[PDB]
Design a protein around this ligand. Sequence first.
Ligand SMILES: [Zn+2]
Lengths: 321, 314
Amino acid sequence: LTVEPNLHSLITSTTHKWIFVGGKGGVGKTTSSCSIAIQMALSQPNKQFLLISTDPAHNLSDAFGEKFGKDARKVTGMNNLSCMEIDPSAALKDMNDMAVSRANNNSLLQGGALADLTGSIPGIDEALSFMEVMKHIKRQEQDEGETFDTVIFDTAPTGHTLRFLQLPNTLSKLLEKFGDISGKLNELKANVETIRQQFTDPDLTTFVCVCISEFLSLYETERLIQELISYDMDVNSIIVNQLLFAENDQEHNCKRCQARWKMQKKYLDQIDELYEDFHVVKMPLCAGEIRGLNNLTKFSQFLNKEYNPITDGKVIYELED
Amino acid sequence: VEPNLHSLITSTTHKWIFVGGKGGVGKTTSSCSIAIQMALSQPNKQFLLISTDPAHNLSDAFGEKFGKDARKVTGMNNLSCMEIDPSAAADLTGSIPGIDEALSFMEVMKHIKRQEQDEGETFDTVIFDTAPTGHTLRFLQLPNTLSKLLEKFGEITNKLGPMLNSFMGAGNVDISGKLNELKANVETIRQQFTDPDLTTFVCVCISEFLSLYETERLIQELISYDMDVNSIIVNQLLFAENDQEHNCKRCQARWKMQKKYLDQIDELYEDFHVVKMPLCAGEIRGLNNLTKFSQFLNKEYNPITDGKVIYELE
Ligand SMILES: [Zn+2]
C-alpha cells in the first residue's frame, strides 16, 4: 500500500506529543512549522498545542505578525494554538553565571561548573540547553494552569540542537574509563535518558524534514536523516517546498521558470525513489511571504490534502498576490 | 581586487589549475571556459583540460568525443581534452585517509606524461575539471598523515618485546617501504601544488545559502591542504533588474534573493576575485557558444551592455 504524500495521519494523530521540524538553507522551515501547528490545532479543537522556536530572529513573531516571547501566548484568531520564542543558551548563561557567583561566595546540576566540560564532551551543552527549554515550558504550564497536549519544536537553523540524545551512551563510555562533577554527570545522564524514553518512541515523537527540490538540499536532507537515525529519532516525513509546477500555471509563461521546474522535477523524482517509505509531501512555490494566520492556514491546508497544481492553483495565487 | 580571472587567464607562471564546485553550479562549463580563455590568450602555449567524471561531461560540453587519449578540441590549436577514470585503471585504503586518493591521482599524472611522451609535445598548463564527488585531493595531507603513523609504530614497536614484536609475521614490511616511497611522491607534488604561482583552485558556486555554505567548507579544506584559493565564480545570476524587465515576478523574486547572497559573498570574500557570471537559460554547448560565454571570465559581464550577447544563446 502506497504511503500517502501528506501529513494527514500525523496532523490527525492523538498519540504524538513532540513534533520536531527542521531543514537547513532557505527551505521554508519556519512556515512549515506554523503550517503543521495550525493544521494540527484546527483538526483537534479539543486539544492545546504549543509551537516553540529558538531562532533569535523571532521567526514566529514575524511569521504570524504578532509578538511572542518567553511567555506563551495564544495565536490571535485561534483557540488552541500558542507560540513562545526563547533563547535557551542565553538563559543558560545567565543561570550558569549566577551559579559561578554563588560558588565564589558559597537544574541543580551546575553548582560551580559542569559547563566547562562543554568544549570537551559533545552534547552536554545541548542537553543543558534543551533542559532549559523544557523548564520554561513546564513553568508556563504550572502558571497558566493549563498543560499543552502537543508541542511542535521549530528547530533552530544551526548547530545540532538534539545531539544530546547521544549524551547517555557518550558518558557511560567515559565514566567507565574514568573508573562532584561525577555526580552531576550521572544526574544529567539520568535526565537525558528519561527524555530518550519519550523522544525515542515512534508513536510519541517524530521529526519532519523540510527541503527544496535541489541537489544540495537533497544531500543536506540525507545528512539530516542519517543523523536523526543515529539518535533513534523517528523520521518518516519530508516536506518539499518552493515547487513551481510551471508545467501548467496561471500567467505561466516564463521560460527561465520552466527551466527551473525541469530541474526540480529531476530531483523530485530522485526523492520519490530514495524515500519511498516516507511521506513526501510536495508544496507549491508561493511567490511572496506567506505571513499571517489567514494565509498560513490557507496554505497549510496542503499539508493535509496533497496539492493539485491543476485544481488548487487558484488558491495559491490568491496569496502570491 | 578585480572581479575577473584576467590575471590568471593571463598568467605565464601557473601550471596547474583546479576547478571545482559541488551541486549544479556550472562547474564543467566553468572548466571549459577557463581552458578556452587561457588557450585563446596564449596561442604560444599548449593546454590540457582533463576530467574524471564518468559521465564524460567534457565530451557532452564540446559536442566531441574525448577519451583516455588527448585530442585537440575541434576548432582550436592549443587546447586538448582528456577524459579518464583513475579509479578504474594495498588495502590500507579503508584504514588510512588519502592513500587511495594519492594512488588515483598518480594514475592521472601517469596517463598524462605518457601522452606527452608519445605525442612528443608537452603541455604547458593543465586545468583539472575536478570530480563532482569525494575529496580528490586529500592526498596533500598523506605525507603528514604517514609521518605521524610511522612514528606511533616506533613509539610502540620500539616499546614492545622481542617476541611480541617479532610475533607478527606477514607481508607488512612489504608496505613500510612502499608507504615511504609514496610519501616521497606526494611530497614532490606538494612542492608543486603548494606554490601559489604554480597552482591554484578556482571555486564555482551559485548565489544561494546552501552553495555559499558549501563553498565556505571547500575553501577551508583547500586551505588545510595549503592549496591557493583566490577565485570564486558565481554562476547562474539572473540580473532580472536589467532583464529588459521580461516580467515574471518569480524571477524578479529569485534575483532579489541572489542579490542578498551576492552581497554576503562580496563582504566575506573581499580579497578574492569574485567573478559574477550571468544565467544563461539553455545548455551552453559547443566551442563557439562556450567561447562567447567564457569571455566574461576575463572582462566582467555588464548586465546592461552585454545582455544582447548572452541572449543570442537563448
Ligand atoms: Zn520566471
